[PDB]
Design an enzyme around this catalytic site. Structure first.
Site, PDB file in Angstrom:
ATOM      1  N   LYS A  53       0.916  -1.135   0.000  1.00 29.56           N
ATOM      2  CA  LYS A  53       0.000   0.000   0.000  1.00 29.56           C
ATOM      3  C   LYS A  53       0.965   1.197   0.000  1.00 29.56           C
ATOM      4  O   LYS A  53       2.041   1.141   0.627  1.00 29.56           O
ATOM      5  CB  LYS A  53      -0.825   0.025   1.276  1.00 29.56           C
ATOM      6  CG  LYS A  53      -1.712   1.269   1.431  1.00 29.56           C
ATOM      7  CD  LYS A  53      -1.187   2.143   2.554  1.00 29.56           C
ATOM      8  CE  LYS A  53      -2.308   2.895   3.279  1.00 29.56           C
ATOM      9  NZ  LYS A  53      -3.663   2.736   2.667  1.00 29.56           N
ATOM     10  N   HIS A 143      -6.342   8.999   8.818  1.00 30.63           N
ATOM     11  CA  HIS A 143      -6.870   7.832   9.509  1.00 30.63           C
ATOM     12  C   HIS A 143      -8.059   8.153  10.397  1.00 30.63           C
ATOM     13  O   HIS A 143      -8.923   8.968  10.035  1.00 30.63           O
ATOM     14  CB  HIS A 143      -5.765   7.167  10.316  1.00 30.63           C
ATOM     15  CG  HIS A 143      -4.595   6.751   9.484  1.00 30.63           C
ATOM     16  ND1 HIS A 143      -4.720   6.409   8.153  1.00 30.63           N
ATOM     17  CD2 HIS A 143      -3.289   6.567   9.800  1.00 30.63           C
ATOM     18  CE1 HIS A 143      -3.544   6.029   7.688  1.00 30.63           C
ATOM     19  NE2 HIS A 143      -2.658   6.115   8.666  1.00 30.63           N
TER      20      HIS A 143
END
Ligand SMILES: [K+]
Length: 270
Positions: A53, A143
């Site tokens: 990722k 996040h």
């Protein structure tokens, strides 16, 4: 056999849950390595992992070594990083801003948005406390911080995803799943299908990924975990699509306009 890098955030563990636990077919065995995204960004500069990722802004720096899978990424309209502060700010000029990593798409977008700030680079989970305690005047958050910042008494200065949408009319590409080109075309196409299957599996059996998400985000409440996957996992996670492709092209065009990335004729996706 193949090391697969991703972060311990609920969106990545949700996406890779099926692939990691053999719930969907994979062309080769995988060995997950869970790291902070900025760590993965740095590693990609050396071409360390064959599958990882990566921040989309960072992908623009390694296109000769990596190609992006069409599946497993993080793009969208309401997933943008936010800038938060203890109270309203007229501007970020001259102020210290805690940031999660110089190679993140979040950092790139903050740099498009404002140019007179002083960056303080730290792990993303240090940002909210640093702003609340007065160590910096603002913080660029990613996040799960987008759901918890009010707990620190903070306010949103700007939602950079919304800012990007207003500026481009496109979703914001945040993170991609990249395969190292030396793995070979066929195996990379097979891995793209494998990752799409893993996303689809979790979408169909979300509760099955819960133990795994908790295991890697032990300080988060289930409420925050479910909110996190709901916010970050969307149609673009299954396939970038024609709009996602246009969005990534625009992001890279903006990077090229600032000499941040070198142009390349190589296709962006597998
Ligand atoms: K909330």
């Amino acid at each position: 056999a193949l090391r697969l890098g991703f972060s311990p955030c609920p969106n990545d563990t949700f996406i890779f849950y099926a692939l990691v636990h053999g719930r969907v077919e994979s062309p080769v065995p995988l060995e997950p390595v869970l790291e902070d995204v900025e760590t993965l960004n740095r590693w990609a500069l050396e071409g360390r992992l064959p599958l990882t990722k990566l921040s989309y802004a960072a992908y623009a720096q390694v296109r000769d070594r990596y190609v992006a899978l069409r599946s497993g990424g993080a793009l969208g309209r309401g997933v943008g990083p936010l800038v938060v502060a203890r109270g309203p700010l007229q501007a970020l000029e001259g102020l210290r801003v805690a940031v999660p990593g110089r190679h993140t798409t979040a950092y790139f977008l903050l740099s498009l948005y404002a140019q007179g700030f002083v960056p303080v680079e730290v792990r993303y989970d240090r940002i909210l406390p640093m702003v609340a305690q007065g160590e910096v005047e603002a913080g660029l958050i990613i996040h799960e911080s987008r759901f918890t910042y009010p707990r620190y008494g903070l306010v949103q200065v700007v939602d950079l995803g919304a800012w990007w949408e207003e500026r481009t009319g496109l979703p914001l590409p945040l993170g991609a799943i990249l395969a190292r080109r030396d793995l070979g075309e066929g195996l990379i196409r097979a891995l793209d299908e494998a990752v799409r299957r893993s996303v689809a599996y979790a979408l169909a059996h979300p509760e099955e990924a819960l133990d795994y998400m908790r295991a890697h985000a032990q300080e988060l409440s289930d409420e925050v975990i479910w909110a996190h996957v709901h916010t970050y996992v969307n149609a673009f996670s299954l396939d970038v699509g024609e709009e996602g492709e246009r969005a990534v092209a625009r992001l890279f065009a903006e990077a090229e306009a600032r000499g941040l990335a070198a142009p390349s004729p190589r296709p962006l996706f597998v």
